[PDB]
Design a binder for this molecule. Structure first.
Ligand SMILES: NCC(=O)N1CCN(C(=O)N2C[C@H](CO)C[C@H](C(=O)Nc3ccc(Cl)c(F)c3)C2)CC1
Ligand SMILES: *[C@@H]1O[C@H](CO)[C@@H](O)[C@H](O)[C@H]1NC(C)=O
Ligand SMILES: *[C@@H]1O[C@H](CO)[C@@H](O)[C@H](O)[C@H]1NC(C)=O
Ligand SMILES: *[C@@H]1O[C@H](CO)[C@@H](O)[C@H](O)[C@H]1NC(C)=O
Ligand SMILES: *[C@@H]1O[C@H](CO)[C@@H](O)[C@H](O)[C@H]1NC(C)=O
Ligand SMILES: *[C@@H]1O[C@H](CO)[C@@H](O)[C@H](O)[C@H]1NC(C)=O
Ligand SMILES: *[C@@H]1O[C@H](CO)[C@@H](O)[C@H](O)[C@H]1NC(C)=O
Ligand SMILES: *[C@@H]1O[C@H](CO)[C@@H](O)[C@H](O)[C@H]1NC(C)=O
Ligand SMILES: *[C@@H]1O[C@H](CO)[C@@H](O)[C@H](O)[C@H]1NC(C)=O
Ligand SMILES: *[C@@H]1O[C@H](CO)[C@@H](O)[C@H](O)[C@H]1NC(C)=O
Ligand SMILES: *[C@@H]1O[C@H](CO)[C@@H](O)[C@H](O)[C@H]1NC(C)=O
Length: 343
């Protein structure tokens, strides 16, 4: 059985619950099938295959799915896509992502790279074939990748072209770092929140990230700086928790000084009603946050970085956190997968 590289229309599988009102469950109930009860990958003996996580149509297909899911599930009170102003009801929803499997139709298979040091591009020497990917949670965020999978050996640097500073860098961690975010109790500032992180763990992992980046940039000095301009979605770590949009200041995470800084790091945050959408250009206005304690505990599993340009003539490389193109979030999980057509 031989194959060739090809794109095709995939379908999706999930474990959505019948009567759950959570928006991810409802969308999967009507747009996905139940997950494969007996999956078994086929190892391809002595096969080496090339992959390119930055040129992978699975990413675009997942992007279209998550756009469609958010479009049917989140209802803003006011939607402003340039000039036009749509007003409607904005009930609060139940929101928590569930795993989605992407699967091939007849005549196609997914090749899976099992190399534990695979960086996302180039050859792979331990290859298997599957009918479906694993369950991928579609977490929308900027700056930090949340609730993903971990690199199995070392910290992995991913980029389409590291020399080109316009190309985003995905840092894939091998040890997750918890981020615990709370909008407490109540009143009438209901938007003020905070995220707590173990500073010992975070600064240890950041140290390891800098050393790994030194390996790629001629043992140069590595400097982290906060973003340099942009809207709040770019300059802040943005994510959705229980349907509410949190914006968190990550200045204390990207400080090169760390000494007397081994305690809990408290990130100031705020819940925003007016957000610049990631699906398409436009603003959306939601209703004020629900009452009660709003809390999310997540795993930081990767970091999105942009390297500063114009530093060739210096001894430093400066890196800033940088989300915005949600495709890279899906890429960080689909990197090991590629679709081929069974000849
Ligand atoms: N047309 C194809 C395309 O690629 N895009 C369409 C338009 N986009 C955009 O304008 N921005 C800029 C905007 C700031 O100005 C922030 C956008 C963004 O990340 N928002 C965002 C919202 C909520 C959450 Cl929870 C989140 F984590 C992120 C990217 C998205 C990119
Ligand atoms: C290939 O990958 C598998 C995981 O699917 C794992 O046992 C190991 O990393 C490799 N095994 C062999 C026999 O090469
Ligand atoms: C990934 O590995 C390939 C070798 O297969 C190499 O050519 C490429 O530059 C690597 N990229 C990074 C970011 O390490
Ligand atoms: C967080 O990470 C731990 C180990 O790193 C893992 O066991 C746990 O399932 C992760 N939590 C989530 C929500 O993925
Ligand atoms: C993670 O990777 C780094 C190298 O980048 C290594 O020093 C460290 O020991 C690894 N941690 C684990 C838990 O494997
Ligand atoms: C990578 O980027 C650098 C700088 O933009 C460029 O000189 C080089 O040709 C690029 N390599 C590829 C394969 O595009
Ligand atoms: C998260 O933080 C809240 C308040 O700061 C605390 O009550 C809760 O126990 C924390 N949970 C974890 C898992 O750290
Ligand atoms: C913080 O991280 C360190 C090292 O990972 C760990 O020993 C400690 O239990 C964690 N929690 C606190 C409260 O220090
Ligand atoms: C984050 O906090 C620092 C001070 O703690 C402040 O200077 C900075 O403006 C804040 N970030 C944003 C995007 O407002
Ligand atoms: C990460 O997973 C935990 C457990 O499933 C969940 O409570 C949390 O809300 C998730 N975080 C995000 C940002 O989806
Ligand atoms: C900066 O780096 C790029 C890619 O490595 C190179 O093409 C360019 O000549 C360098 N310096 C300047 C001043 O352009």
């Amino acid at each position: 059985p031989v194959w060739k590289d090809a794109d095709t229309t995939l379908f999706c599988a999930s474990d959505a619950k019948a009567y759950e009102t959570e928006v991810h469950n409802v969308w999967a109930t009507h747009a996905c099938v139940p997950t494969d009860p007996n999956p078994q990958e086929i190892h391809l003996e002595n096969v080496t295959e090339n992959f390119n996580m930055w040129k992978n149509n699975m990413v675009e297909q997942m992007h279209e799915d998550i756009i469609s899911l958010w479009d049917q599930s989140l209802q803003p009170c006011v939607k402003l896509t340039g000039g036009s102003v749509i007003k409607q009801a904005c009930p609060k929803i139940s929101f928590d992502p569930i795993p989605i499997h992407y699967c091939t139709p007849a005549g196609y298979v997914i090749l899976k790279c099992n190399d534990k040091n695979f960086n996302g591009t180039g050859p792979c020497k331990n290859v298997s074939s599957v009918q479906c990917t694993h369950g991928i949670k579609p977490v929308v965020s900027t700056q930090l990748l949340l609730n993903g999978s971990l690199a199995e050996e070392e910290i992995i640097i991913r980029s389409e072209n590291l020399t080109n500073n316009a190309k985003t860098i995905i840092v894939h961690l091998n040890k997750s770092v918890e981020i615990n975010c709370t909008r407490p109790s109540n009143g009438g500032d209901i938007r003020k929140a905070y995220c707590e992180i173990n500073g010992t763990k975070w600064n240890k992992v950041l140290k390891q990230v800098t050393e790994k980046l030194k390996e790629h940039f001629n043992n140069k000095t590595i400097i982290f700086q906060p973003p340099s301009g942009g809207d709040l979605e770019i300059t802040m770590h943005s994510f959705n928790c229980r349907g509410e949009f949190f914006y968190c200041n990550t200045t204390q995470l990207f400080n090169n000084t760390c000494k007397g800084c081994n305690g809990t790091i408290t990130l100031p945050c705020k819940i925003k009603q007016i957000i610049n959408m990631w699906q398409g250009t436009g603003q959306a206005m939601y209703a004020p946050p629900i009452d009660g304690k709003i809390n999310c505990v997540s795993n930081i599993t990767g970091i999105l970085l942009t390297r500063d340009g114009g530093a060739n003539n210096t001894s430093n490389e400066t890196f800033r956190p940088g989300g915005g193109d949600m495709r890279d979030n899906w890429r960080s999980e689909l990197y090991k997968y590629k679709v081929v057509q069974i000849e």
